[PDB]
Structure 1
């Protein structure tokens, strides 16, 4: 009752660029705008592997992970943009730089946590308090929320999408108590106003469109973000949680899309997030561990406390290349040449990072996969990273992995290598 926390203490947004790599290429090449198009890596094997897909192409059934040749079977007029190749490998520099454009715009509004190349969490609690102070009890106009959906509305006693959006928004604003500066629903509504402003700023200053979720924590903000894409934002209030979760597959909640979610479904014999409410905290801890159990018990009630971390920059800088099937590296020379290619890209990115961000990586992580291993990585070794020098880094990586070569022949490498990975970690201020 009066002491039961409700996880309504924060306003958190998650902003996620729509079909990000596609928008980067469409900004660059106007011929691709408003077309079924996709971004692809490589080209020789089955036309290349698709990594990003415009919504026009998605209407034909084109998806990520599809080979371009097969996507062309579904969408004959599909246009393609190729990822840059440098030093024999795909190079994602263009997308990292576009990401920096968006992250720097978002950081003007609030502290952000970079969650991936194209998405960031925003802690809007403080910004909401100031905006509420400026508003001075003034009602919030639907005009301030031109692209916002209120999850769960309209409800109760138009057949077009925008009509429904406005109906729900009208119901929500009609119900709001604007005189209580401490109302969680009001705080979320002001948050959504700020996110409308953030998203307009991103589109104005970059050309890129995005979607966003606004809620009281990161998990609900992420889930909300996905409910109305593209180019829209969704507010998930605390009160919307019971109905939303009553038919929400467990796997749709962030961190439950893999084995743990599968085990929750299998062990408990449930399908939807809301069904978790029927278990005690101790029961959930008994099956999934103390930490997971406490997290699940609160999350199924819409409560999560993971903070928006103040971190705009990635914590590691890595380069990697797979060598599938017959291309697996089977000679020492091959392994050293590709280690050099990776190390040269890594050096270029590390030097840029050091100049821009006043930091230096101090550890080099070397990871390989050997042909015949189910795991993504077969082996991981670290060494000191003391100089931004590609030849030294590639030599050091070879030194830490050379004993993995079973082969009795000095010139040959066995078992052949199907993956190489170099990652600079453990940054210190400089």
Structure 2
């Protein structure tokens, strides 16, 4: 009853760019705008691999991970933009720099947690409190929420999507008690007003559109974000959770998309997030461990406490390349040349990072994969990163891996390497 926490203490948003790498390429090249188009890396093997798809192209069935030649079978007029290649490898710098553009705009409104190259969480609790005093018990006009969906509405007592959106929004606003400065629903609404403003700023100042979710925690905010994409934002209230979760596959919730989620389904014989409410906390802890069990018990009730961490910059800087099938590295000279290529891109990014962000990495992590293994990584070894010098870093990387070579022969490498990875970690201020 009165002592039962409801996880309504915070206002959290998740802002996620719409078909991000595609929009970066469409800003650069106007011919690609408002077209079925995708971003591809490499070209020689089956037209290259698709890593981003415009909403026009999705309508034809084009998806991420599809080969471009296969995508063209679904969409013959599909337009393609290629990822830049430097030192023999895909180079994602243009998209990292576009990410920074967006992150710096978001940071003007609130402290953000960078969650990926194209999304960040926002803790809006304080900003909401401030806007609420500005408002002075003034009602929130629908005009302040021109792209917002209220999940679960309209309900009860109609043909257009925008018409439905506004119907739901009006039901929501009509019910709001604006007199209470601590009503969670009011706080979420004001949160949504601020995110409309954030999203307008991102679009005005970069040309990029995005979607967003507004709720009381990160997991619900992310789920909300995807409910109405592209170019829209969705408010998921605490009250909307039982209906929303009653038909929500468990795999849809962040962190449950893999083996744990499959185990929840198999062991408990359920399909939907809401079905978890029928287990005790101890029951869930018995199956899934103390931490997961407690997390699941609260999460299926819409409650989660993971903070929006104040971190805008990535914690690691890495450079990775696969060498699939017959391209696998089988000579020492091969392995050394590619370590140098990776090390050279790493040095470039590290040096820029040091100038921009007043920090220095102190540890170099080296990872490889060997033909036959189908783990992502076969071996991970660390060494000291004492200077930003590609020749030194690549020599050091070779040193820490060179005894993986089963070859009795100096010059040959066996088994061949199907992946190399250099990652700079453990930053210190400088």
- Normalised to the residue count of structure 2, the TM-score between the two structures is 1.00
Partner of 2:303: 303
Partner of 2:75: 75
Local SS of the residue matching 2:307: coil
Partner of 2:132: 132
Using the alignment, how far apart are the partners of 2:240 and 2:361 within structure 1?
Answer: 45
Residue 158 of structure 1 and its aligned partner are, at CA, apart by 1.9
Residue 241 of structure 1 and its aligned partner are, at CA, apart by 0.1
Q: After superposition, what is the alpha-carbon deviation per residue over 1:2-54, rounded to whole angstroms, capped at 9, x for unaligned? A: 00000000000000000000000000000000000000000000000000000
Q: After superposition, what is the alpha-carbon deviation per residue over 1:81-129, rounded to whole angstroms, capped at 9, x for unaligned? A: 0000000000000000000000000000000000000000000000000
Residue 286 of structure 1 and its aligned partner are, at CA, apart by 0.1
Partner of 2:193: 193
Using the alignment, how far apart are the partners of 2:133 and 2:315 within structure 1?
Answer: 36
Using the alignment, how far apart are the partners of 1:65 and 1:412 within structure 2?
Answer: 33
Local SS of the residue matching 2:138: coil
Residue 174 of structure 1 and its aligned partner are, at CA, apart by 0.0
Aligned pairs for 1:25-424 within 5 A: 25-424=25-424
Residue 66 of structure 1 and its aligned partner are, at CA, apart by 0.2
Q: After superposition, what is the alpha-carbon deviation per residue over 1:191-214, rounded to whole angstroms, capped at 9, x for unaligned? A: 000000000000000000000000
- Normalised to the residue count of structure 1, the TM-score between the two structures is 1.00
Q: After superposition, what is the alpha-carbon deviation per residue over 1:351-377, rounded to whole angstroms, capped at 9, x for unaligned? A: 000000000000000000000002000
The answer for unaligned runs of 5 or more in structure 2 is none
The answer for unaligned runs of 5 or more in structure 1 is none
Residue 182 of structure 1 and its aligned partner are, at CA, apart by 0.3
Local SS of the residue matching 1:4: coil
Using the alignment, how far apart are the partners of 1:352 and 1:241 within structure 2?
Answer: 44
Using the alignment, how far apart are the partners of 2:316 and 2:283 within structure 1?
Answer: 37
Q: After superposition, what is the alpha-carbon deviation per residue over 1:44-88, rounded to whole angstroms, capped at 9, x for unaligned? A: 000000000000000000000000000000000000000000000
Local SS of the residue matching 1:239: coil
Using the alignment, how far apart are the partners of 1:333 and 1:241 within structure 2?
Answer: 58
Using the alignment, how far apart are the partners of 1:347 and 1:387 within structure 2?
Answer: 9
Using the alignment, how far apart are the partners of 1:209 and 1:319 within structure 2?
Answer: 28
Equivalent pairs counted in the alignment come to 430
Local SS of the residue matching 2:319: strand
Q: After superposition, what is the alpha-carbon deviation per residue over 1:255-291, rounded to whole angstroms, capped at 9, x for unaligned? A: 0000000000000000000000000000000000000
Using the alignment, how far apart are the partners of 1:157 and 1:322 within structure 2?
Answer: 56
Using the alignment, how far apart are the partners of 1:105 and 1:336 within structure 2?
Answer: 41
Residue 218 of structure 1 and its aligned partner are, at CA, apart by 0.1
Using the alignment, how far apart are the partners of 2:36 and 2:328 within structure 1?
Answer: 34
Using the alignment, how far apart are the partners of 1:411 and 1:39 within structure 2?
Answer: 38
Local SS of the residue matching 1:25: helix
Residue 157 of structure 1 and its aligned partner are, at CA, apart by 1.9
Local SS of the residue matching 1:318: strand
